[PDB]
Structure 1
Amino acid sequence: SSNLTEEQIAEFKEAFALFDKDNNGSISSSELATVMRSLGLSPSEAEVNDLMNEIDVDGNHQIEFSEFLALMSRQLK
């Protein structure tokens, strides 16, 4: 991961947490797709399949703001 910075992660936290019901710092995949386009981007279906397969363990799960960005950096802008 060679990009992004401090301020960048900031805007990401507000987004990811914006849909984090538990408010503990974790959101559901269905919510990750939103925070994704909310930051100012818009990948494609194929891009989503790989993005989830790199984190999704089966069907539903609790995503973490950490791994969320720690991986999103593999396909951002």
Structure 2
Amino acid sequence: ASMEDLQAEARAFLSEEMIAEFKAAFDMFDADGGGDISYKAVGTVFRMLGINPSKEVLDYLKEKIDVDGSGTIDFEEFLVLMVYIMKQDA
């Protein structure tokens, strides 16, 4: 599904500790320093946390989030992306 479907469900698909875990990588990559990181930054969050996305997801996330984003990607979108991976991954 698209971000529109995944946005609310994402936080429910994962456990609270997963959300808290991912927040660590988001916090360091916060480019605006407020709730917003770079689009490629979230893609890198995967690597640093041992998550391996498909080659298409890397570019996918950037453009999909860019439509709703304002030059950056929100914490929600960053969280949603993880979930999108967890679905395709294994």
Q: Does the pair score TM above 0.5?
A: yes
Structure having the higher helix fraction is 2
- TM-score normalised to structure 2 length: 0.66
Percent of residue pairs bearing the same amino acid type: 45
1:13-33 Cα shifts (integer Å, max 9, x gaps): 110111113321210112122
Give, in whole Å, the separation in 2 of the partners of 1:54 and 1:74: 12
Give, in whole Å, the separation in 1 of the partners of 2:31 and 2:62: 20
Please say if 1:18 is aligned against 2:13.
no
- The answer (yes or no) to whether the contact 1:20–1:27 under 8 Å persists in 2 is yes
Poorly superposed stretches of 4+, deviation over 4 Å: none
Give, in whole Å, the separation in 2 of the partners of 1:31 and 1:5: 22
Counterpart for residue 72 of structure 1: 82
- TM-score normalised to structure 1 length: 0.75
Choose from 40, 45, 49 the match for 1:30.
Answer: 40
Q: Structure 1: any 5+ residue segments left out of the alignment?
A: none
Query: How large is the RMSD of aligned CA atoms in angstroms?
Result: 2.2
